[PDB]
Amino acid sequence: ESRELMSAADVGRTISRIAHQIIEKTALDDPVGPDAPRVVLLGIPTRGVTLANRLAGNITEYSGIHVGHGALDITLYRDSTSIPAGGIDDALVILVDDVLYSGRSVRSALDALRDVGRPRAVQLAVLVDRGHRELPLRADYVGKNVPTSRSESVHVRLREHDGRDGVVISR
Amino acid sequence: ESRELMSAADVGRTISRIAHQIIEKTALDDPVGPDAPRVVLLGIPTRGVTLANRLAGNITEYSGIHVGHGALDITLYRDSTSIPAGGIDDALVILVDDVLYSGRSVRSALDALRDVGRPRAVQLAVLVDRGHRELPLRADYVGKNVPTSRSESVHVRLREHDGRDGVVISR
Amino acid sequence: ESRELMSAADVGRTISRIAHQIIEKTALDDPVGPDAPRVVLLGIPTRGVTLANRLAGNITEYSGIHVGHGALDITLYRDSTSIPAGGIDDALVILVDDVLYSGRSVRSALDALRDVGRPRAVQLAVLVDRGHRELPLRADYVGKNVPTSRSESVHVRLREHDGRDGVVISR
Amino acid sequence: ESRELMSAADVGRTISRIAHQIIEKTALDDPVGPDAPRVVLLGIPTRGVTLANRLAGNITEYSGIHVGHGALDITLYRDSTSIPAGGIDDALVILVDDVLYSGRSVRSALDALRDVGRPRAVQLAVLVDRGHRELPLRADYVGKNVPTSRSESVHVRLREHDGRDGVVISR
Amino acid sequence: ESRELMSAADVGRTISRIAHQIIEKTALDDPVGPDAPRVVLLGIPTRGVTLANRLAGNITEYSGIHVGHGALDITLYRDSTSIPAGGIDDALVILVDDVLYSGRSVRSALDALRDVGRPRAVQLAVLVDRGHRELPLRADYVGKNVPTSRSESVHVRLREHDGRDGVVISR
Amino acid sequence: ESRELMSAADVGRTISRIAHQIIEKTALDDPVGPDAPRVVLLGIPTRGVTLANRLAGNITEYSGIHVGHGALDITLYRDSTSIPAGGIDDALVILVDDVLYSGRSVRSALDALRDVGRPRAVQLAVLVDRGHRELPLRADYVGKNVPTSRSESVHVRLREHDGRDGVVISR
Numbered sequence A, B, C, D, E, F: 001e002s003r004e005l006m007s008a009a010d011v012g013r014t015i016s017r018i019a020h021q022i023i024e025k026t027a028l029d030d031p032v033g034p035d036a037p038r039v040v041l042l043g044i045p046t047r048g049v050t051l052a053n054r055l056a057g058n059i060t061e062y063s064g065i066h067v068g069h070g071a072l073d074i075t076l077y078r079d080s081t082s083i084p085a086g087g088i089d090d091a092l093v094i095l096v097d098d099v100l101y102s103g104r105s106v107r108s109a110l111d112a113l114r115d116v117g118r119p120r121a122v123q124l125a126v127l128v129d130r131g132h133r134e135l136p137l138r139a140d141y142v143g144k145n146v147p148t149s150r151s152e153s154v155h156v157r158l159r160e161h162d163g164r165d166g167v168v169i170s171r
């Protein structure tokens, strides 16, 4: 059994709001001072990459600033990577995924990240937080908090990846 | 120069509340069973270890449950560990520290923790969150959120370690 | 399904009786002379440790004597150890577990013990003997002899560990 | 001061009774089945070997079944081995010694035994238990329980080994 | 022969005095800082470790301060080590032994200690100074100065080790 | 700024007293022997060497005995050496320095010494002890104990090294 949690319009509005939170919180709009570092969005393959790419698109549309974005493979970090020109050294890296659950993927991403470089800081953006974290990891940007039973599943859908925008829950 | 954020009485009341939050959230009080894992408090040296010991004491006094507690040395995980007998495999491990700052100490603790065993989940408790995180790490239990400038310093004082309970800020 | 072998009151009366047997059999309350060894309780994780801790407490209450007690990790002795101050050399060590079955856990304890020191003697106390030994090992103190089939399971519950006292058998 | 605890006739009656206990308890004359494994008697050198050999003779005389028997050297297991064809894997091994005292020799046999194979279970048979065990080890078959002071000695004599059957105590 | 230098009551009163000297001299009661460093007691195996543990208990009882305490093996430093979590860097380490003689054991401890970390300072506490030093090493805390000949031996007894507290001299 | 702690006459009187203490304590003028080892003074470069040399002269003047004396370089022993004919094996070695402070130089000397030979024993003589030791090292001969703040400096002057005898303190 399945049900719609977010419509295509819902996801659009939320992704847009997330993009503006990012702009607000990083001030990427400003002349990048000493204490205001360049932003890089790295998505967790593969739908996380889709989300990071769209966020990058939105931010460019709203601010005129082109933020670097890529992908961070975590296959070899569980108990192809693509980094923008300029790397991540002393940058603000925003890890991006579609769903935050136990948090174990994000920890893998943190591990993977240090084989790449040394960011000034790392943030996390997700479309959905479905709870039941198993590590003290939290998203800095959350599209929607979706309370779930352990037996339920949350399914994020993005146009470029799955054919439609939407979020569905099933049991 | 210097000023008091928490009195000894403040620290006492706050620690007692955290202990009850832990009891509430883990339900260590009711008969264990399949769905309630044993809880282990691991402190980050040294005041985190002090705080962990006090929390364990408080928890036993309020619930009658003896929680395992120890210390997690993180020296070889930056830039001797003490785990209660029976280990931490499939336990709910709560990392304990006095101050949450950048979060890098907590990350080191997670790394050290992974060379020790495989917990069911890991939570984090701190007396003070002074902001300025550089990782997407957040405490599940927080004594007090203390806004600070980077130039300021937070000094937690615990009786078993410093002769008195209290939290002071300096510049 | 499930059935009760011992009520909480049962467990209390029995643990108290065991405590007094130990005191009687070791004469630990008498003025320790040259030829009368100090008693050390080492529990096998985890409920054996709970049981060892409670017994030590009981012994102090009934005799005023504080016996050293700790835990003996046997994980690397099958397929962190905690030894009280003064160690176990020339001591009378009482291994404590909740259930005696095949006896292999106890034999592992004997192996683990031999990497710790050389006691004068080793005894064994258990809450329940459910039979079916596969080694010539027997307990010196037994809470209750419970005949069981190979298909049954024995579940000991102790207050400090599980919130309640009791022993149940299931099939 | 010397004194006789058991006459030759005593030893004879007692060894014969043990043989029948073994036959009864292992049902070795019945068809070897899942819960009825082949029996192997291994004596501890050297008089234990004599006793194991006698028991095998008696068992054959009473049941017509020839049980495998040999010796288990424990020299390299303290603080020449001879195994019957078919080994001891999944067998019921009965360790045999003349006197059970501290229990340390038997523990050595247990250690020595696992460098030989994996028995289904291990039992222990001794002619005399003189008490004062220093380990939680007990014999499954005991010829005679002989109370002794720490200063007394128990001496087993078997004909094939010493020239007579008998048991003597000295101080 | 043998003779008593200190009674159990003597040892208790003296150990208590040492504990207060340590508290006074380190100002352990005051907040850990530059002029009051964190204290760690490291005992020399084996009775030195027990004594360190006893001192820690006393200090806790008198001051409420829980001092780290452990053991420093000096086997590999002549002609099992246990360090509390957080190590000894910039700590005040107090080496503890039962008897100071030639001073060679203490020097080995000093060597072993720098393979562990870099303390702010190192002090020494002993129950007995038996004279005859062969190095310019002296204890900062001394229980009793006992004049002895080269042919005499001093035997310290601690309850957790020997059942009683006491100091005897023999020839 | 500065003030005089010891006049040239003071230093002369003190150095003379130290020489006689050495003679008294080592009995170097007596017919040597098994339990009376030859004395060797080794100074720490450079003013310590001057003091050792002056002491040797005094001892010779007062006793007629010529003690071997030299220098012990400690440059390679932190964080030209000259050893008298006959070496230091089984000798009584007296390390000599002008000022004893933290004691870290003296420990280096003990380390430097083990690369030279094996003395029967090692003593230490200094003109001034200004306190603030960071190790359990003490001088066996002390010219003068000078209480000082950590912010002060102690300056020893010897004629052969600096043109005059004296001790001055500055802040």
Ligand SMILES: O=c1[nH]cc(F)c(=O)[nH]1
Pocket: A154, A155, A156
């Ligand atoms: O049902 C799903 N399968 C795989 C996915 F990645 C997802 O989001 N949802």
Ligand SMILES: O=c1[nH]cc(F)c(=O)[nH]1
Pocket: D047, D154, D155, D156
């Ligand atoms: O007196 C004895 N000597 C040797 C033995 F093996 C024994 O059992 N008794």
Ligand SMILES: O=c1[nH]cc(F)c(=O)[nH]1
Pocket: F047, F154, F155, F156
């Ligand atoms: O300035 C100084 N030079 C050399 C010294 F030995 C001293 O004490 N002070």
